[PDB]
Amino acid sequence: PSGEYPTVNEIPVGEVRLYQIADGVWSHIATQSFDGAVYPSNGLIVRDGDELLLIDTAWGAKNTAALLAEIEKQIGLPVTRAVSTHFHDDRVGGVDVLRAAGVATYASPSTRRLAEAEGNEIPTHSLEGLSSSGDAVRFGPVELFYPGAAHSTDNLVVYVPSANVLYGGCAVHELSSTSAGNVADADLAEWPTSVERIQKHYPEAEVVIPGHGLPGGLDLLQHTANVVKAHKN
Ligand SMILES: CCOc1cncc(C)c1-c1c(C(=O)O)[nH]c2c(C(C)C)cccc12
Numbered sequence: 344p345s346g347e348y349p350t351v352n353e354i355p356v357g358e359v360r361l362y363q364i365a366d367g368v369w370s371h372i373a374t375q376s377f378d379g380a381v382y383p384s385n386g387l388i389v390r391d392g393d394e395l396l397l398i399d400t401a402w403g404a405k406n407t408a409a410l411l412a413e414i415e416k417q418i419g420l421p422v423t424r425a426v427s428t429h430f431h432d433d434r435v436g437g438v439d440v441l442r443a444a445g446v447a448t449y450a451s452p453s454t455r456r457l458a459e460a461e462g463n464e465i466p467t468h469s470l471e472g473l474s475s476s477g478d479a480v481r482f483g484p485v486e487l488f489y490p491g492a493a494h495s496t497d498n499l500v501v502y503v504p505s506a507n508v509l510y511g512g513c514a515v516h517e518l519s520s521t522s523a524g525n526v527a528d529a530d531l532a533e534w535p536t537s538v539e540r541i542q543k544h545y546p547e548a549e550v551v552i553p554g555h556g557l558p559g560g561l562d563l564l565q566h567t568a569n570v571v572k573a574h575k576n
């Protein structure tokens with residue numbers, strides 16, 4: 344990639360790439376196959392003093408092991424905590440690897456129940472205070488925000504106040520998206536309302552990072568609403 348945002352075509356098989364978003368903020372990018380198609384996915388890394396906070400796995404056990412190695416190579420600070428932003432395997436697949444590497448894993452109770460029911464890996468610790476739309480809590484160097492049902496009923500977004508970075512996860516799509524992605528667990532009717540809540544809560548966001556694909560600015564929020572409305576119809 345040589346400084347461009349990593350895509351499947353520039354991540355070697357089985358590997359992970361990092362991308363510097365801001366001072367003390369990186370995204371991580373990996374590739375996975377699902378139902379015979381290949382997808383990229385993102386997560387976040389936020390410096391937390393002399394430790395790191397991880398947001399989301401790298402979509403799979405081996406990808407997540409590779410993520411930890413890439414962090415060691417590129418950053419060299421220990422990952423001590425991880426938050427998963429909803430229950431799908433692109434968010435929790437790799438939690439068992441994290442837990443065996445000494446990382447304390449967290450998710451909302453809603454995510455943990457959904458992951459358990461689905462047969463996905465289950466974060467250890469429950470994040471209370473996020474059950475009502477509009478709720479926010481602090482977690483190390485980030486704020487966690489529950490915008491309401493969107494891509495999933497449990498989806499969380501993450502804001503990094505020091506950098507004005509909004510990590511939307513899978514509730515937010517990249518600008519090139521033409522479709523609403525994997526809508527199996529989505530609430531298409533509520534999704535625009537949930538995006539509006541994000542827009543209202545984080546009007547100073549400078550970088551918006553989707554769950555899959557390229558970061559951009561605030562326009563990703565309105566684009567997401569547009570694509571979801573067009574899909575539903
Ligand atoms: C079925 C079509 O899904 C898509 C289509 N286009 C783009 C994306 C990113 C997806 C996609 C998303 C997402 O939209 O977040 N999540 C996925 C998962 C989870 C459940 C692990 C698996 C397979 C594909 C996706």
Ligand SMILES: [Zn+2]
Nearest residue numbers: 429431494513
């Ligand atoms: Zn998902």
Ligand SMILES: [Zn+2]
Nearest residue numbers: 433513554555
């Ligand atoms: Zn996703």
